[PDB]
Write a protein that binds this ligand. Sequence first.
Ligand SMILES: Cc1cc2nc3c(=O)[nH]c(=O)nc-3n(C[C@H](O)[C@H](O)[C@H](O)COP(=O)(O)OP(=O)(O)OC[C@H]3O[C@@H](n4cnc5c(N)ncnc54)[C@H](O)[C@@H]3O)c2cc1C
Ligand SMILES: Cc1cc2nc3c(=O)[nH]c(=O)nc-3n(C[C@H](O)[C@H](O)[C@H](O)COP(=O)(O)OP(=O)(O)OC[C@H]3O[C@@H](n4cnc5c(N)ncnc54)[C@H](O)[C@@H]3O)c2cc1C
Ligand SMILES: NC(=O)C1=CN([C@@H]2O[C@H](COP(=O)(O)OP(=O)(O)OC[C@H]3O[C@@H](n4cnc5c(N)ncnc54)[C@H](OP(=O)(O)O)[C@@H]3O)[C@@H](O)[C@H]2O)C=CC1
Ligand SMILES: NC(=O)C1=CN([C@@H]2O[C@H](COP(=O)(O)OP(=O)(O)OC[C@H]3O[C@@H](n4cnc5c(N)ncnc54)[C@H](OP(=O)(O)O)[C@@H]3O)[C@@H](O)[C@H]2O)C=CC1
Ligand SMILES: *SC[C@H](NC(=O)CC[C@@H](N)C(=O)O)C(=O)NCC(=O)O
Ligand SMILES: *SC[C@H](NC(=O)CC[C@@H](N)C(=O)O)C(=O)NCC(=O)O
Ligand SMILES: N[C@@H](CCC(=O)N[C@@H](CS)C(=O)NCC(=O)O)C(=O)O
Ligand SMILES: N[C@@H](CCC(=O)N[C@@H](CS)C(=O)NCC(=O)O)C(=O)O
Ligand SMILES: [Ca+2]
Ligand SMILES: [Ca+2]
Lengths: 587, 587
Amino acid sequence: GTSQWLRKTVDSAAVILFSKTTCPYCKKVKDVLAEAKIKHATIELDQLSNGSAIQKCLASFSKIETVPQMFVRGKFIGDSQTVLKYYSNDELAGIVNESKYDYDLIVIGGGSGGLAAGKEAAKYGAKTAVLDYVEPTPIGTTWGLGGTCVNVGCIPKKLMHQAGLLSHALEDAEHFGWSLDRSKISHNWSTMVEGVQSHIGSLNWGYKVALRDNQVTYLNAKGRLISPHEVQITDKNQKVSTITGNKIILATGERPKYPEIPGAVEYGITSDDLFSLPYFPGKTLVIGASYVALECAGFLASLGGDVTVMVRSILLRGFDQQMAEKVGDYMENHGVKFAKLCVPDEIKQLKVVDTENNKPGLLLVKGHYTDGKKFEEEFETVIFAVGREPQLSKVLCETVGVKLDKNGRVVCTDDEQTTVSNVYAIGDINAGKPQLTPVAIQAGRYLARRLFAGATELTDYSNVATTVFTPLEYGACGLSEEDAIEKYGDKDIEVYHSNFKPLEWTVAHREDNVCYMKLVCRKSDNMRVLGLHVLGPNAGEITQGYAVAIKMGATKADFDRTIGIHPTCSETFTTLHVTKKSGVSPI
Amino acid sequence: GTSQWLRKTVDSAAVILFSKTTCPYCKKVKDVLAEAKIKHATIELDQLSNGSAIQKCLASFSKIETVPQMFVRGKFIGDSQTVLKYYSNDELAGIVNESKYDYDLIVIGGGSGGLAAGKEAAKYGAKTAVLDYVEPTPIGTTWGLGGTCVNVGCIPKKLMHQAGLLSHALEDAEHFGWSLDRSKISHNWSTMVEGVQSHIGSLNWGYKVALRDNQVTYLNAKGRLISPHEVQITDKNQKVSTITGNKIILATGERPKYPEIPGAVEYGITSDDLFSLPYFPGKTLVIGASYVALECAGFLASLGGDVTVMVRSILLRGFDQQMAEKVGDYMENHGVKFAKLCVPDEIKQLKVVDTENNKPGLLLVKGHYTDGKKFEEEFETVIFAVGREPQLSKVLCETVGVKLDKNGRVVCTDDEQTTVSNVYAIGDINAGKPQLTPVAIQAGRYLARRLFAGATELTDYSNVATTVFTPLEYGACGLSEEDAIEKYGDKDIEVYHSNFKPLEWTVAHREDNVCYMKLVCRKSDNMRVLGLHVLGPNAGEITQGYAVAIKMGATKADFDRTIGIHPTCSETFTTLHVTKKSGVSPI
Ligand SMILES: Cc1cc2nc3c(=O)[nH]c(=O)nc-3n(C[C@H](O)[C@H](O)[C@H](O)COP(=O)(O)OP(=O)(O)OC[C@H]3O[C@@H](n4cnc5c(N)ncnc54)[C@H](O)[C@@H]3O)c2cc1C
Ligand SMILES: Cc1cc2nc3c(=O)[nH]c(=O)nc-3n(C[C@H](O)[C@H](O)[C@H](O)COP(=O)(O)OP(=O)(O)OC[C@H]3O[C@@H](n4cnc5c(N)ncnc54)[C@H](O)[C@@H]3O)c2cc1C
Ligand SMILES: NC(=O)C1=CN([C@@H]2O[C@H](COP(=O)(O)OP(=O)(O)OC[C@H]3O[C@@H](n4cnc5c(N)ncnc54)[C@H](OP(=O)(O)O)[C@@H]3O)[C@@H](O)[C@H]2O)C=CC1
Ligand SMILES: NC(=O)C1=CN([C@@H]2O[C@H](COP(=O)(O)OP(=O)(O)OC[C@H]3O[C@@H](n4cnc5c(N)ncnc54)[C@H](OP(=O)(O)O)[C@@H]3O)[C@@H](O)[C@H]2O)C=CC1
Ligand SMILES: *SC[C@H](NC(=O)CC[C@@H](N)C(=O)O)C(=O)NCC(=O)O
Ligand SMILES: *SC[C@H](NC(=O)CC[C@@H](N)C(=O)O)C(=O)NCC(=O)O
Ligand SMILES: N[C@@H](CCC(=O)N[C@@H](CS)C(=O)NCC(=O)O)C(=O)O
Ligand SMILES: N[C@@H](CCC(=O)N[C@@H](CS)C(=O)NCC(=O)O)C(=O)O
Ligand SMILES: [Ca+2]
Ligand SMILES: [Ca+2]
């Protein structure tokens, strides 16, 4: 496959140097490229097991088999003497700038995936543009560069989770001997929001600076792909123009859904609004039951809010349902109210948001339970967390020839390629992929490296660990218990499980037999670990290291031979014994 | 090796049943043994790849090759009919009780290792005794069952660490929008100590109950081995008697050292005293610089104490010294004072501890720096943390024939065997082994399983992860950078490193470029991970999962293909790039 590899690399790379580490002629070219501040990929052939065969294949493109060999956009440009000739004649800059298109890469969307792809491509000398535009929410919320995670997702969510966790740190402090008067302590929502937004601000600015420093062109503009190589852009001044690019990356992400009921769009809010909400939500209804719903309900409650979650059917559809029940039971036991098997029919306004005193309005929510009981209750704030959807066009998109699925997501190969061959999709819009920030980031970086640096490594989307940052956190890697049973049959599945109590919870007088972990294992495959699950503090820190071991194909015996660190919650994974089949209590 | 395995198992096991899972005669024996509450090991031959050869070998001991086959203390006892015959004649109890010795196992020491070994042996029907006695410290401190960790180590240390961490949670709360008056918050040492000691109390009681429930005989008594099978015991009433045992496990642990200076023993304290100290230490000097010193100095400071650490030479000798410098620099930047290259010459009393008002005394510490400067300063409490030593006898011990090393530790094989063949040593007294609780626990359990359940698995003492619970925590697994360079040469070592900032530290306005991690890797061995190091919050939770991957032989590429969980500190391990050799800043 070394012939096809070289062909793909030469044809895709913007600026690439085939080299050897002990070659003084290769060094002379590197010195020239650095002095002229020409960024490029470098492949050192003496570092590759097939490097000699690569040298032979290079003659298909250059007629030579020596190093160095410099290419620009599919075209052999010269050996060392030739490159030096361009340098001394001041032709080199013109040569490396020469292109059929305005850009080697246009990235549409400047979130986790887009920024990662864009910055990484610039590193190998690709002329790169990143387009980002934030369509306002129905109530007008907008924000800066960085995408969902930075502005309206992981970052503000985890920070509000921390604010929530600190509530309980205050309770725990007393049992640890701290003398404070908790009846006189209160939380100020807007102060927290100011601190959160101040940090987000530094991230917005940070990414802009990063794009500058990597010589990526940033356009605060809405992009539309109108042909394989043509992107139509609309600026703030509403000016329309067209830019051309060799490769296009679609990284446009998703936006929250609203249910199709009266008053939803007019009076409700979503996560998009919540994280910069200038008033405190007050008595809140969250509609929905997956991780956005539960994470938001959870930090709101810990801040002292009166919180209700309206659950159509189950919690965290798609997650292990025993773990999901445990996540919910903990939240229920700690003040979060659940309206079970209940759907909303309408929102009616009773009071407008006080914009001067930064206070919430008041809403009437009518709904109904499965049994026929009507739901009718007042809330200061209604939050919809009922899924997220991509914002591209079944028709328009197909007219440029990019195929979307039923749900409006882009159908891609295992190297992120769409049905238009120079066009790729990464992050949340890529059909079938886990919708997480580091996945989008890994995909973008790996994709940029393949396109412009001749890398071969595909993103591995299997066994990607997650954490739901509910009040008690839930970390998982691999399969749910039910999905593993479905795949391999009950008789081939062994589950090791245990309750545990963090040492910190002992003096603090918190629950026995609530924190919980399990390993789902396949008997036939040497007790291969198929799924890991932990409900407990710092679950994400706990889970992460185990995701490496699982990707390497960890078995139970691997876990068993490993010695614990004491005292930690994580060490419980190293001494698990009780199986579910034995019926013995995990307590 | 299946002949030797069976010989060792039959000869060592107290009560063992060789069986098959589909045999109704084996089930009949199991029913009998359960009805008569006879605990035993069970080996299911149809579950072992060499089970058929085992069946053939069993005839060397029983003259039969069928299942079931029951053994007691080296002696074939019967097939199923025979066992049922003993049952119906009411002979079975007598048979299984028959022994040359009072016990199959005597465990001397009831700490982490001893309790683990003892409880695990009882599970397979071994008649087990555990001896524990706590020699009082010079000032009279004593405590209950469970050993160093439970009473004067990991447990109270981590709980005081948590109390310390909560101090900073209080500072962080305000930036997260919590309204509290910190100028009016103070810490009460004795309240904290009460909560800590109350939990320890429940552990003492818990272990006693566990020994009861597992039918282990517990003797609060000092044991001395006087011959291979004879243990002399001294009770509280000072009564001396002798008990005999087949196997002996030495699990007697260590005690803090004092330097040989005037006033040390009379006026100073150690970790043994600190965790139940009924007065607050006040202005404190810690003498020493390894993890006990730094962990204690650290939580004392976070509680608002005026703390000084007197450092003979370096911090954390034996740990990676770049990481050790970083641990210290953080503590120095946060109020802990270091008297560098300084040794104590004498302690003099200025004030006696106030025993009625639970207040500390006052001490004068004289010492000298390497340059000739005298050290002279007043402290309310002086803490020695200058190492720990075993408490067994170079002569007495050798007279029973158990060999000790230069440092007084027991010299053992890789299966914990001493130079006396029925005598084993586990935990801190085992020469050359990492001195950690879960190591002692794993060793005890694995040892009990080998002796009484026919297991083969040795404890793996390589790449055991640790965490130093300093104010900023330090987790490590595998080799220091300097030890890896020493082993494989500089040219074969690549180090990937990065600073990071916990997301929580952003709103809280804490340090950039202080949290830090690295992977020490071997170039020749496919960038094999030889050492992992992380300085940051929750370092132990971070480190633990990676210890499984490292035991499996993780390479850098394994880390690279693994996707991060966002947002966590741990995910930084999944995207490391910067190498030390490149000179690029980790910032
Ligand atoms: C509340 C919440 C909490 C979350 N928490 C976590 C978490 O803890 N951990 C985790 O891993 N993931 C979390 N996620 C998911 C994570 O945020 C996403 O998976 C990730 O941000 C998606 O990255 P992206 O690059 O695909 O899209 P985005 O980050 O959404 O970027 C797309 C960008 O392109 C813009 N755009 C759209 N159309 C155009 C156009 N045509 N022209 C120009 N620009 C356009 C969009 O406005 C946006 O700025 C969370 C998500 C939410 C909603
Ligand atoms: C301050 C401190 C903090 C620590 N923190 C951690 C940590 O965070 N994580 C970790 O893994 N490790 C930690 N350790 C180490 C851990 O405590 C030890 O490694 C472990 O307890 C040793 O177990 P052991 O069974 O060998 O000995 P021990 O637990 O010391 O048990 C020995 C017992 O036997 C008794 N004994 C002695 N002689 C006799 C006799 N002849 N007859 C009868 N009984 C006798 C002793 O009094 C004691 O009760 C810490 C240690 C200290 C001192
Ligand atoms: N890594 C992380 O910590 C986080 C990641 N995310 C990302 O965000 C994405 C989507 O977030 P989220 O908003 O939680 O959506 P999800 O796709 O995860 O789930 C939608 C939820 O809303 C409910 N729902 C859907 N329609 C209705 C309806 N019309 N009426 C009432 N309830 C309804 C569903 O319940 P039902 O089962 O009945 O259909 C389900 O509980 C996820 O896919 C994930 O990738 C979000 C939060 C945290
Ligand atoms: N896992 C964990 O979190 C923890 C485990 N432990 C266990 O406890 C054991 C011992 O604890 P520790 O007390 O820290 O002892 P250590 O053996 O770890 O180190 C002794 C320390 O005291 C110093 N020292 C020794 N003698 C003198 C002297 N006479 N004058 C001044 N300073 C001196 C040494 O400095 P120098 O370099 O100059 O010799 C060194 O810093 C460890 O081996 C470990 O297994 C302890 C705490 C935490
Ligand atoms: S996928 C084809 C293309 N879509 C986009 O470039 C993004 C559209 C999305 N931002 C939106 O609709 O908001 C497209 O719509 N083609 C336009 C055309 O004229 O062919
Ligand atoms: S190791 C030989 C034996 N030691 C012990 O059983 C423990 C001694 C220790 N607890 C202590 O000294 O405090 C021993 O000392 N032999 C005595 C003898 O008379 O041979
Ligand atoms: N004319 C060439 C010189 C090529 C040359 O002498 N390079 C040597 C390496 S220093 C080479 O490619 N031959 C050895 C090999 O097979 O790699 C240039 O200017 O680049
Ligand atoms: N007399 C024996 C009966 C032994 C017997 O019939 N056992 C069968 C299993 S059910 C056996 O060991 N033979 C089959 C084999 O080779 O495992 C007893 O009472 O234990
Ligand atoms: Ca283990
Ligand atoms: Ca990665």
